[PDB]
């Protein structure tokens, strides 16, 4: 019941429409990976070991990954902060050698503390209430030489433990995954970074497959 | 001398803004009641077409 | 010492214009329009249903013809529809996906997108090569692009997170006007009908009107407690409504220069993501956090009839410019063309 | 630029074999439906075949059905016409035609400059073979139709072409009153039902060459006898 | 006489367990969720298939109740006594494509919809098969239905019963060889993972994965092993004091076959953390 145009108007509406299921099926193919953090924290340095938002793609094992880095948007968060809902995962970088230091634009802010509150509010965000987070410690070798000089006491006044680096290292992670207040809808995957680190890449695969799986037994209903 | 300079700014903006002529609200909710009572025949949200005007049947 | 006195100046000017707002405010529109009778029960029905996005829909622009849409998703897909027989006439893949805004030129001849890439690109789609390519990028905010809307072929408006508007000239690729004065992102703008003025909302609660050619701001309106998302100027061109996260929408008048009527509803807690008007204006379509879209009596302020067919967001609807219909885009990745039957 | 090049053409002998390429370039090939047009010595213009994009759809003119074959290679922009048995009958020059379907397009757009070939249904009438002309004077052509071109939609699905001397034919107006991308205003095309006439104010030297009617309503698509502008 | 009081009670239990089950299963399929997997697909027709069995039971109830006097009309039983066997090996079969799509997603919603339309059309032919064999064949008695008959004569019948019964084990065959794989698969993902911050989930789904074998087993796996004897015994010619034997001990198995209608929406709701949290809240 349709002209000879119409009937080829209609054939180039499902030729769109197979070019545009395909499309789909290979962006559902590839995991896509928020990158956060603070300023100077190593986060830089993860995206060389892998004006407005910066995507970052490499391949790993057969998989295909995005890693969307918006630490250069200095607009409001909670404005743009759900296109993001539907990552694979969170990959956070916090600066252990920033425990003892002083955020430089508040000048009587300890920058660990900043990292606190700025994970608290992610991990804790409405739009990331099922999106796993990959907490990466960087900066531990510069960690340790500051522990010799200055006691993790300034950082935290209410620490007890000893002042040994392993000890050190392990009671920073304990109190970030204890801002955790979903612990059984996400998972928080902790690793620890350095410069020289080679296994990063590693796992994040490890990280991203863990969760690849999961997901699926939540949709075969038997998780 | 950025706040300063950021005070003369804002408060030389505000003169303009209050130096605009203000109709009273009467007059103006009138001109609002009086267009939309015009162009009410010639809304096909407000009054549905018939079914033989309509694109999307 | 100045600074103290200069601010101290600036509180006297607000009082002196919030004096002068209250001084003409003698009646109110409610009272002004109590006699007329209500537009009664407004059902409207889905006559198409746009498939084929596969991600969240975050703007959508009719054409000028009023039958042709164009549509933004972040599976980094521009859109453009034939709304009659909802066939696909093109589908143009973004460089970046992170779109959040989408603006149909006049001409119909380009289409304009941007998102946080910073970026309003500029698309032909009337090319000899019978393909849409880029024709223009427009860089220079240093913030995200909330919305776009073109003067004609060659002038583009933008507003970004940077807080700051921005005239462009499309051939030149430069910006001929830049519009600060708001302290927050600014989400949304909206042309006048003889596209010499345009508002403005942003996220520290207040909406701005600006000359295009003089480039200043004319007003400021206040009133909203939250970020405004949208704004839709009234189609005379003399008031424009908002739409903020407080769950309100209100009605300013340019001449007036202050708010005029409040649309809110106790059930209503969720955010407002889109506004527009009926051709007459008589209707005020918003949409909103809570997978539906309220048509309102502008006039009356009643909720007329609500759209309910989306499973998520409205984030975005649009009235074309012969009033037969209203299409309304959604976080479920489709888009929904809706007019009423005698 | 967009460009298409027609090659293979050449004297054959009855009852055989030749291969007919079209070379695009300058334009997104895969996007375009493509015709075959031909045009017998001192004859109108007269469709052969249509592939569509996607190579779906392919529709064939009866006095050629069953012995020609179209088909088309989008990753080399290269257009085919395999014909066989061919006849005495099939002594023309045929064109490469450019054509895309969406809404508000222009089919019919771009012609090929034609290769040379030699051998050893609603009827559209154009009654007027010849009109003499002098430059400025306007100038109206009428065409006919058996059946009514006015579709349901609102289209006539009319079009207008110009072949001046030498050259390949060019798109005046599509659907009865759109005009053609690079062509002057001062064209107009204007119809009804199943009359049409095509006026041309300030006519100029350019415009002398010949001018067919062609139905898009239905396949197969038919040219009108052609009216000839002289001065 | 005993047979019959434990009948009406075995099958009180699961009417209403079974109801209640499917219905707030059926809310949670359609209602809360308004977007559903491949496998939310099977498991919203098993529980339409279920319900249907569930609506079956009154009819046989109230058999059991008038003391095996069935008033009503002759055809009815016969389209009551096929539409509850016809909901039983509708779950059965698409049981199996759970599992076999369970296997694939763990070591497409267009095809799941097919095949759940594809296997009721496929099951409503084998209903119409059976009801047009079993009238058209000869002429029933009415006064009581749901008992015991000899098919010699109507041996076309029991083919089509003994089919049925070998596809069974074609299908439990799958059911046993994916779960065990899920099963297996799970467990040696959980030793190689286990330096993570949860381990213990791949050792929890692969328990889950094993219950629902178990429960299929135990439902299912008696009333069919048992069944070669029925079919064996309506066609050749045995004592009528075997007989009864059989029929006791098939309809006590059937029962336990009933079972599994009002295990599958409970099985479904507790290894899914996503309900048991919407089930809270
Ligand atoms: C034969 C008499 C006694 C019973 C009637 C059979 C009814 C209940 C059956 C037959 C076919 C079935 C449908 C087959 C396919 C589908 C598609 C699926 O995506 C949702 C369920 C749905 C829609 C089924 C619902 C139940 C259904 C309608």
Redesign the pocket.
């Given at each position: 019941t349709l002209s000879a145009e119409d009937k080829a108007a209609v054939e180039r509406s499902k030729m769109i429409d197979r070019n545009l299921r395909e499309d789909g099926e290979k962006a559902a193919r590839e995991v896509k990976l928020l990158l956060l953090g603070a300023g100077e924290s190593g986060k830089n340095t993860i995206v060389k070991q892998m004006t407005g938002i910066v995507e970052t793609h490499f391949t790993f094992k057969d998989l295909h990954f995005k890693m969307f880095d918006v630490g250069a948007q200095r607009s409001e968060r909670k404005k743009w902060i759900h296109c993001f809902e539907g990552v694979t995962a969170i990959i956070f970088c916090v600066a252990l050698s920033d425990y003892d230091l002083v955020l430089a634009e508040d000048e009587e802010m300890n920058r660990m503390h900043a990292s606190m509150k700025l994970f608290d509010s992610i991990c804790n965000n409405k739009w990331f209430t099922d999106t796993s987070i990959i907490l990466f410690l960087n900066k531990k070798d510069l960690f340790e030489e500051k522990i010799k000089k200055s006691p993790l006491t300034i950082c935290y006044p209410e620490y007890a433990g000893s002042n040994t680096y392993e000890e050190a290292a392990a009671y920073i992670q304990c109190q970030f995954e204890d801002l955790n207040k979903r612990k059984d809808t996400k998972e928080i995957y902790t690793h620890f970074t350095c410069s020289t680190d080679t296994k990063n890449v590693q796992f994040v695969f490890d990280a991203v497959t863990d969760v690849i799986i999961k997901n699926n037994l939540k949709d075969c209903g038997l998780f | 001398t950025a706040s300063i300079a950021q005070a003369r700014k804002l408060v030389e903006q505000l003169k303009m803004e209050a130096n605009i002529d203000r109709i009273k609200v009467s007059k103006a909710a009138a001109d609002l009641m009086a267009y939309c009572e015009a162009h009410a025949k010639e809304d096909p949200l407000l009054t549905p077409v018939p079914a033989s005007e309509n694109p999307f049947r | 010492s100045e600074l103290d006195q200069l601010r101290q100046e600036a509180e006297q000017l607000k009082n002196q214009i919030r004096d002068a707002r209250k001084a003409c405010a003698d009646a109110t529109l409610s009272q002004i329009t109590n006699n007329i009778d209500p537009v009664g029960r407004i059902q409207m029905r889905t006559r198409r249903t746009l498939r084929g996005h596969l991600a969240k829909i975050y703007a959508m622009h009719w054409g000028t013809d009023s039958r042709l849409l164009v549509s933004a998703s972040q599976d980094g897909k521009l859109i453009i529809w034939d709304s009659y027989t909802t066939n696909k006439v093109h589908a143009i893949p973004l460089r970046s996906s992170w779109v959040m805004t989408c603006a149909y030129a006049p001409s119909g001849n380009y289409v304009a997108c941007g998102g946080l890439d910073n970026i309003c690109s500029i698309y032909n789609l009337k090319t000899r090569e019978g393909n849409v390519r880029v024709s223009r990028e427009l860089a220079g905010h240093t913030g995200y692009l909330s919305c776009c809307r073109f003067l004609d072929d060659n002038q583009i408006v933008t507003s970004s997170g940077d807080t700051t508007c921005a005239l462009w000239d499309i051939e030149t690729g430069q910006q001929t006007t830049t519009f600060t004065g708001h302290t927050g992102d600014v989400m949304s703008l909206s042309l006048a009908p003889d596209t010499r003025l345009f508002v403005s909302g942003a996220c520290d609660a207040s909406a701005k009107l600006w000359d295009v050619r003089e480039g200043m701001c004319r007003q400021t309106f206040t009133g909203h407690e939250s970020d405004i998302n949208a704004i839709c100027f009234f189609p005379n061109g003399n008031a424009f409504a908002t739409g903020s996260d407080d769950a309100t929408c209100r009605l300013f008048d340019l001449r007036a220069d202050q708010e005029l009527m409040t649309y809110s509803h106790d059930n209503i807690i969720c955010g407002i993501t889109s506004v527009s008007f009926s051709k007459s204006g008589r209707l005020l379509l918003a949409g909103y956090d809570d997978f539906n879209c309220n048509v309102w009596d502008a006039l009356k302020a009643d909720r007329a009839g609500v759209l309910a067919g989306h499973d998520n967001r409205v984030s975005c609807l649009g009235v074309t410019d012969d009033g037969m219909a209203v299409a309304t885009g959604s976080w479920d990745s489709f888009l929904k063309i809706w007019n009423g039957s005698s | 630029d967009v460009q298409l090049v027609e090659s293979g053409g050449g004297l054959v002998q009855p009852g055989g074999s030749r291969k007919l390429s079209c070379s695009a370039s300058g334009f997104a090939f895969s996007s375009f439906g493509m015709h075959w047009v031909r045009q017998a010595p001192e004859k109108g213009l007269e469709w052969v075949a249509y592939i569509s994009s996607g190579s779906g759809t392919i529709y064939y003119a009866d006095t050629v059905k069953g012995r020609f074959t179209i088909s088309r290679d989008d990753p080399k922009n290269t257009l085919f016409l395999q014909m066989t048995s061919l006849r005495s009958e099939d002594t023309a020059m045929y064109y490469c035609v450019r054509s895309i379907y969406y809404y508000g397009s222009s089919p019919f757009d771009f012609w090929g400059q034609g290769t040379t070939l030699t051998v050893s249904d609603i009827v559209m009438t154009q009654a007027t073979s010849s009109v003499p002309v002098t430059p400025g004077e306007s100038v109206s052509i009428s065409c006919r139709s058996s059946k009514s071109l006015l579709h349901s939609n609102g289209n006539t699905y009319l079009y207008w072409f110009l072949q001046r001397p030498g050259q390949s034919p060019q798109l005046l107006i599509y659907r009865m009153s759109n005009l053609a991308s690079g062509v002057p205003d001062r064209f107009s095309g204007s119809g009804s039902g199943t009359a049409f006439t095509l006026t041309i104010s300030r006519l100029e030297a350019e415009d002398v060459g010949v001018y067919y009617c062609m139905q898009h309503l239905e396949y197969p698509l038919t040219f009108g006898a052609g009216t000839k502008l002289e001065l | 006489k005993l047979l019959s009081t434990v009948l009406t009670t075995s099958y009180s239990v699961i009417f209403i367990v079974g109801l209640v089950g499917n219905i707030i299963a059926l809310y949670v399929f359609l209602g809360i969720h308004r977007k559903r997997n491949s496998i939310q697909?099977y498991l919203?027709?098993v529980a339409?298939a279920d319900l249907?069995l569930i609506f079956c039971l009154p009819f046989r109830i109230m058999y059991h109740i008038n003391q095996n006097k069935w008033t009503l009309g002759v055809i009815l039983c016969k389209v009551v006594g096929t539409?509850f066997y016809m909901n039983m090996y509708i779950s059965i079969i698409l049981l199996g494509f759970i599992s076999l799509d369970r296997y694939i997603k763990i070591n497409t919603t267009k095809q799941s919809?097919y095949v759940?339309?594809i296997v009721?059309?496929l099951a409503?032919g084998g209903?119409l098969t059976m009801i047009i064999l079993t009238l058209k064949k000869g002429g029933h008695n009415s006064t009581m239905c749901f008992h015991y008959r000899d098919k010699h004569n109507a041996k076309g019948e029991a083919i089509f019963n003994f089919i049925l019964v070998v596809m069974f084990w074609l299908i439990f065959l799958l059911i046993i060889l994916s779960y065990i794989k899920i099963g297996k698969n799970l467990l040696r993902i959980s030793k190689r993972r286990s330096k993570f911050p949860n381990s213990g989930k791949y050792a929890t789904t692969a328990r889950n994965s094993f219950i629902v074998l178990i429960i299929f087993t135990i439902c299912f796996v008696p009333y069919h092993a048992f069944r070669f004897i029925y079919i064996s015994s309506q066609l050749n010619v045995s004592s009528c004091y075997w007989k009864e034997i059989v029929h006791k001990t098939n309809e006590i198995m059937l029962v336990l076959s009933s079972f599994n209608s009002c295990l599958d929406p409970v099985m479904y709701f507790l290894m899914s953390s996503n309900i048991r949290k919407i089930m809270c809240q």
């Open positions: - | - | - | - | 697909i919203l027709n339409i249907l539409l919809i759940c339309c009721w059309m409503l209903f």
